[PDB]
RNA sequence: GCCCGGAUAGCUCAGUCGGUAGAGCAGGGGAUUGAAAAUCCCCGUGUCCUUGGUUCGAUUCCGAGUCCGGGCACCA
RNA sequence: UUACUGUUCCCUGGGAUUGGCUUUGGGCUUUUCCUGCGCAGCUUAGGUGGAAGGCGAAGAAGGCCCCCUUCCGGGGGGGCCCGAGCCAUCAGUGAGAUACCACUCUGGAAGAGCUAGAAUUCUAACCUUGUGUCAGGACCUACGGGCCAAGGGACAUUCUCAGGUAGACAGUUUCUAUGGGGCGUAGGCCUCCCAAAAGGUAACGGAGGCGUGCAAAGGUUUCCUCGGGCCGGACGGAGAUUGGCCCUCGAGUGCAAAGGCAGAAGGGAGCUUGACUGCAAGACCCACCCGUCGAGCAGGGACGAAAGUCGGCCUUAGUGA
RNA sequence: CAGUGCCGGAAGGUCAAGGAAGUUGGUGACCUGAUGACAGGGGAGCCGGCGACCGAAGCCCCGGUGAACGGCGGCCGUAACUAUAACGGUCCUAAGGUAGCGAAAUUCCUUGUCGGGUAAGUUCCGACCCGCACGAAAGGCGUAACGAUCUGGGCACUGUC
RNA sequence: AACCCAGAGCUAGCUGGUUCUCCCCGAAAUGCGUUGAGGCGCAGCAGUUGACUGGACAUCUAGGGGUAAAGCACUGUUUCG
RNA sequence: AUCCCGUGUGAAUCAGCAAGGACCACCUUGCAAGGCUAAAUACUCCUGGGUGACCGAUAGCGAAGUAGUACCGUGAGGGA
RNA sequence: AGACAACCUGGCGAACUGAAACAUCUUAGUAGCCAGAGGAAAAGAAAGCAAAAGCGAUUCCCGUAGUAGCGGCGAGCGAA
């Protein structure tokens, strides 16, 4: 409704099937209040593949 | 499925209106050929 | 879940084949009328949904976002 | 029966049985013609190419008029009259001459082509009738057979596929506790009481709540103390903002209730995303399924000077194999 | 004539099978890449998904139809004494029960109240209307004749007593 | 919703019945879930069989608690002053 | 996938065609749309031999005597 | 041409039942009924299996195997 399930996705992740040790597209998931904050949420979070804290944006 | 017009190639043995002179080559619908032309001796169906 | 169409004056919708933003009511005024109504005429208001792009410039064309009105579906 | 899932009668589209001629006509075309107001201008700049040659007596410029489109700026074009010109890098313009020519795009026209749809016929399929007429040894005004005729006619019927549609029909479902009747109510989770100072615990016993919310109401570093009396102060009053003394936890904590919590878990400010990945000794709760707590390790971080804290939220509801 | 059915209507929306422009994928003769034990692009053909547009009845839509299914309300206030309400206001519906009947095979409270019949009548007959909850072809209200009908009373008659 | 035969020894979480003797041990009527309530699964409590164990019955000490009693420090309630 | 059928369309002949569990390539295997054929296997109204930890008149077949008889039923049927 | 116990082939083809209800599924292509032929019937001479190694019509028994699978992925069904 006004409170929604949102997927965060690593921006610097390449879906092409990368050549490194572990290949995959990091997604986290969480909830947002779509009314309170209409701005697409951006969050710095850990990515198991890139191995560093990356920036995870959103998907529509 | 999709209706497929039946085509019977024939030779006319007599003159009939809209068709032509005797001894003539044509192609026809199958109902026309078998129900009308063929019982009256008028046409002949050709596969040489 | 898909498929269409919309967001334009306070309300209801007309829209060049991009160069002025418009109708019909709600309102204000004038007598109409001894008084009511018809009868009639005037006047007021706009970020043409939000964003970027195209363009010498856009309500008009296009992308994304948001909402609204309907049409059609499925074996947790 | 307007419970569910279907079946049938019945209606309507494709296919098949199933043909001829003619129209009318919706969407595509086959030559071929119409048609375009960025601005700098000879002026309503079609893109791209052959591109110094073309259009004329199979009779042009220029005026007299008929038609049609229209942004009445002007464009295509029929008749006549006219008689030797409309022309090209000629300078502009992203793109060239209305000198000409090829595939074509905006929409229009026309004869020609595909498919319907539609309407009209026509007769040979098919249908329907006949004390019409033949027919064997004899009849078939005894059903029927052959022929002829008459009326319909590519409809209808039959078949197949599809949508619609009758409890006409078939199989079935219709919980538990209410007061062991209708009727509405109740059915999961959380807090308190009952509950007998471990834990557990019933009643149609007594009270209430939940089916989420917050991008900060999380993380962290750091500072702060609420509420209530009494008094002063322009409007201002019981009550707003401000000053001060006394009581000291009586306020608050997103929402019930209970238990917590004062230099705090309450109020504020700064920077943040640990509301992480990979896990995990051991416990508690336990019929099972679930459920809860977590020291500790590694990675990569946030805040902080550092020590350190951080795997969402003071705790317990906010969920579903 | 709103709901439901039934009939008629044809402009719009919805509308299956089936057609069908067109896209899209798998394969692959081949063409290149490549310090890994291979990889990427691809003609024709075959195979698959999707599919704008065409696509009937029905439904949504518009109208008629009660001897079709059925339905036929509330709330106030007001007349020289108390009373009642012909009269007005308001609410709501598709519309608000007309003629006639009415304590009835219908009346709950209820043995309503009144009259009659009886010495005495919860039944009976006539009437009032405050119809819990009559009512017009599920007919309304009358009605002579008729009934092994239901129900009240009277004469005759009797061991019913 | 006839009868007769067959599927059929249907199905009945229901009721009835279930036959010789001695010896040893010996329950439960509780919790949870259930289209469940008079059924069933698991647990609890029988028997028999093993593997570990060292307790039980007493005695004393230590824990935490918020009942009986008690109280007005809080929350209500209440009488009069 | 393979197999077999209603309605409708509808191929290819060995340089083919089918199968190898959608489909395409490659290889392997096979030759549909014409027929016919013994044995190993199933059974007991029975026939002939054999055996029986099978019955012995409430048993064994419904039937050790009129037994599908008597009797009952309109009849199917029941049935000592 | 009719008769004929069981077996067999073909055609029609249930329901109670199980699923702790029931509708897909199960019962079961079972019973029954009809038709047909034989001492057996049917099937049968690879347009078949298999997997890179090989087999060589059909039927029947053992085994693979309650395996692979199928299934309101329930009850159950169940190969080669
Ligand atoms: Mg055809
Ligand atoms: Mg049809
Ligand atoms: Mg046809
Ligand atoms: Mg005729
Ligand atoms: Mg005759
Ligand atoms: Mg005749
Ligand atoms: Mg005619
Ligand atoms: Mg037809
Ligand atoms: Mg149908
Ligand atoms: Mg029924
Ligand atoms: Mg139905
Ligand atoms: Mg205790
Ligand atoms: Mg306790
Ligand atoms: Mg309780
Ligand atoms: Mg904060
Ligand atoms: Mg003050
Ligand atoms: Mg609270
Ligand atoms: Mg508290
Ligand atoms: Mg704090
Ligand atoms: Mg540590
Ligand atoms: Mg830790
Ligand atoms: Mg760390
Ligand atoms: Mg630092
Ligand atoms: Mg906090
Ligand atoms: Mg009506
Ligand atoms: Mg109507
Ligand atoms: Mg109407
Ligand atoms: Mg109609
Ligand atoms: Mg229409
Ligand atoms: Mg459509
Ligand atoms: Mg289609
Ligand atoms: Mg196509
Ligand atoms: Mg492709
Ligand atoms: Mg390749
Ligand atoms: Mg490829
Ligand atoms: Mg259509
Ligand atoms: Mg229609
Ligand atoms: Mg009208
Ligand atoms: Mg009437
Ligand atoms: Mg008065
Ligand atoms: Mg009135
Ligand atoms: Mg009135
Ligand atoms: Mg009025
Ligand atoms: Mg109204
Ligand atoms: Mg009306
Ligand atoms: Mg009216
Ligand atoms: Mg009246
Ligand atoms: Mg009157
Ligand atoms: Mg009267
Ligand atoms: Mg009375
Ligand atoms: Mg009456
Ligand atoms: Mg009444
Ligand atoms: Mg009474
Ligand atoms: Mg009296
Ligand atoms: Mg009286
Ligand atoms: Mg009496
Ligand atoms: Mg009376
Ligand atoms: Mg009434
Ligand atoms: Mg009545
Ligand atoms: Mg009536
Ligand atoms: Mg009557
Ligand atoms: Mg009478
Ligand atoms: Mg009579
Ligand atoms: Mg007398
Ligand atoms: Mg006597
Ligand atoms: Mg009957
Ligand atoms: Mg019966
Ligand atoms: Mg059975
Ligand atoms: Mg039994
Ligand atoms: Mg029995
Ligand atoms: Mg049963
Ligand atoms: Mg003992
Ligand atoms: Mg006990
Ligand atoms: Mg029971
Ligand atoms: Mg048990
Ligand atoms: Mg034991
Ligand atoms: Mg103590
Ligand atoms: Mg103690
Ligand atoms: Mg205490
Ligand atoms: Mg307590
Ligand atoms: Mg006490
Ligand atoms: Mg006190
Ligand atoms: Mg006190
Ligand atoms: Mg095969
Ligand atoms: Mg195979
Ligand atoms: Mg095949
Ligand atoms: Mg078949
Ligand atoms: Mg061939
Ligand atoms: Mg083969
Ligand atoms: Mg062959
Ligand atoms: Mg075949
Ligand atoms: Mg053969
Ligand atoms: Mg054979
Ligand atoms: Mg005897
Ligand atoms: Mg005997
Ligand atoms: Mg004896
Ligand atoms: Mg025979
Ligand atoms: Mg016979
Ligand atoms: Mg025989
Ligand atoms: Mg069944
Ligand atoms: Mg059943
Ligand atoms: Mg069952
Ligand atoms: Mg059962
Ligand atoms: Mg043999
Ligand atoms: Mg044979
Ligand atoms: Mg051989
Ligand atoms: Mg052969
Ligand atoms: Zn990443």
Tab-separated table of C-alpha atoms (C1' of nucleotides) and ligand atoms in Angstrom, chain E residues 1-5 65-66 68-70 94, ligand 25:
chain	number	residue	atom	x	y	z
E	1	C	C1'	-41.816	-0.688	-15.282
E	2	A	C1'	-36.765	1.380	-10.460
E	3	G	C1'	-35.051	-4.563	-9.004
E	4	U	C1'	-36.520	-9.417	-11.881
E	5	G	C1'	-38.522	-11.819	-16.270
E	65	U	C1'	-44.943	-4.897	-20.992
E	66	G	C1'	-48.689	-6.810	-14.078
E	68	A	C1'	-45.655	-11.277	-15.798
E	69	C	C1'	-41.989	-12.134	-10.502
E	70	G	C1'	-43.595	-9.168	-7.246
E	94	A	C1'	-40.276	2.602	-8.495
I	25	LIG	MG1	-40.732	-2.985	-12.114
